[PDB]
Amino acid sequence: AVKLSYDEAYDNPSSSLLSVTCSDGENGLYPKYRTFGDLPGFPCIGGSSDIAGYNSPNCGSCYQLTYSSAHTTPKSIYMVAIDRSAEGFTASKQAMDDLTNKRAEELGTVNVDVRKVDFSRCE
Numbered sequence: 523a524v525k526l527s528y529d530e531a532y533d534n535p536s537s538s539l540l541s542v543t544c545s546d547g548e549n550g551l552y553p554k555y556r557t558f559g560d561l562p563g564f565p566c567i568g569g570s571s572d573i574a575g576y577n578s579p580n581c582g583s584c585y586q587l588t589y590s591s592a593h594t595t596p597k598s599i600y601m602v603a604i605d606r607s608a609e610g611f612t613a614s615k616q617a618m619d620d621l622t623n624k625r626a627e628e629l630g631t632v633n634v635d636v637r638k639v640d641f642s643r644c645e
């Protein structure tokens with residue numbers, strides 16, 4: 523497993539793709555997507571340590587993140603990675619609340635299973 527955290531920066535649909543690591547360049551997401559809210563499956567977007575820096579080939583990849591709660595059955599979300607995180611993943615608060623049944627703030631950071639999946643799964 524890997525760590526999943528959240529950051530409410532990813533909940534603002536109006537933020538520019540120029541504000542994250544996966545800005546422009548061959549692998550960047552601007553100008554195809556101008557703002558966060560243009561991303562497929564917004565607000566299920568965020569950062570990953572698989573984004574090594576500018577122009578990473580992992581920019582725009584779709585990750586299935588699965589949380590197995592102590593108190594309920596498994597749930598997955600599908601996150602588009604657009605930004606570097608220094609370790610593991612950092613999603614929107616809405617995405618982490620979706621994953622954990624509204625416990626993002628309470629938990630802060632959870633362990634998840636991760637698989638890179640087809641981009642269609644984030645659509």
Ligand SMILES: [Cl-]
Binds near residue numbers: 524572636
């Ligand atoms: Cl990973």
Ligand code: NA
Binds near residue numbers: 627
């Ligand atoms: Na709060």
Ligand SMILES: [Zn+2]
Binds near residue numbers: 572
């Ligand atoms: Zn990875």
Ligand SMILES: [Zn+2]
Binds near residue numbers: 609
């Ligand atoms: Zn570590």
Ligand SMILES: [Zn+2]
Binds near residue numbers: 641
């Ligand atoms: Zn495909």
